[PDB]
Amino acid sequence: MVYVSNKYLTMSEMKVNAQYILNYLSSNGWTKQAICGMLGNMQSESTINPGLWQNLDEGNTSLGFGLVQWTPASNYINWANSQGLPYKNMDSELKRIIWEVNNNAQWINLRDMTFKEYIKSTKTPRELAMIFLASYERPANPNQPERGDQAEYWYKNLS
Ligand SMILES: CC(=O)N[C@@H]1[C@@H](O)[C@H](O[C@@H]2O[C@H](CO)[C@@H](O[C@@H]3O[C@H](CO)[C@@H](O)[C@H](O)[C@H]3NC(C)=O)[C@H](O)[C@H]2NC(C)=O)[C@@H](CO)O[C@H]1O
Numbered sequence: 001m002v003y004v005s006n007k008y009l010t011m012s013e014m015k016v017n018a019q020y021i022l023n024y025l026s027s028n029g030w031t032k033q034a035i036c037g038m039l040g041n042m043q044s045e046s047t048i049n050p051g052l053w054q055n056l057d058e059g060n061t062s063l064g065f066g067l068v069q070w071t072p073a074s075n076y077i078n079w080a081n082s083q084g085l086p087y088k089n090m091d092s093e094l095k096r097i098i099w100e101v102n103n104n105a106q107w108i109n110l111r112d113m114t115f116k117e118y119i120k121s122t123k124t125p126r127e128l129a130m131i132f133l134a135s136y137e138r139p140a141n142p143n144q145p146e147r148g149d150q151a152e153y154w155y156k157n158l159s
Pocket residue numbers: 045054064068069070071072075136137138139140141
């Protein structure tokens with residue numbers, strides 16, 4: 001059970017999606033801290049919503065889409081289409097992230113941590129959130145300390 005829409009999610013809806021992601025990536029070898037650092041980012045990017053378009057601008061593939069706001073959306077959507085996966089889908093977006101770790105895509109090592117180090121890290125959710133922000137997301141505004149608060153929130157409130 002997950003929410004997938006082009007709409008901002010409430011805290012209760014986010015928590016449903018966030019527990020789902022935690023469970024999924026735990027089975028694929030990620031630490032709870034690394035997952036929660038990324039969740040802190042996904043909350044700012046998309047309110048942890050796999051259906052979310054940047055500005056709620058549905059169908060604009062030049063802009064951000066999905067949990068981490070792949071920008072241009074086509075970066076992700078072309079890959080899903082090419083792989084035979086439905087693009088507007090929680091698991092499809094999670095499979096993209098695993099694909100990126102495996103193929104060293106998306107990540108630029110700006111904090112002396114590789115993507116493979118990151119998913120195995122037991123540093124704080126706050127620290128990992130800031131690393132993930134700087135290395136993976138890289139938005140125009142680098143100053144979003146909220147992502148670290150949010151990572152700590154999920155680490156505390158999820159199982
Ligand atoms: C207005 C705004 O901030 N829009 C946000 C997007 O900027 C952001 O997506 C990220 O955009 C950056 C900068 O364009 C991307 O980084 C670039 O990626 C390419 C890799 O092909 C590389 O050539 C550049 O060196 C690199 N530039 C920099 C400065 O790092 C980055 O890949 C995008 N991130 C993702 C996940 O797709 C998204 C996500 O934060 O949010 C928009 O709101």
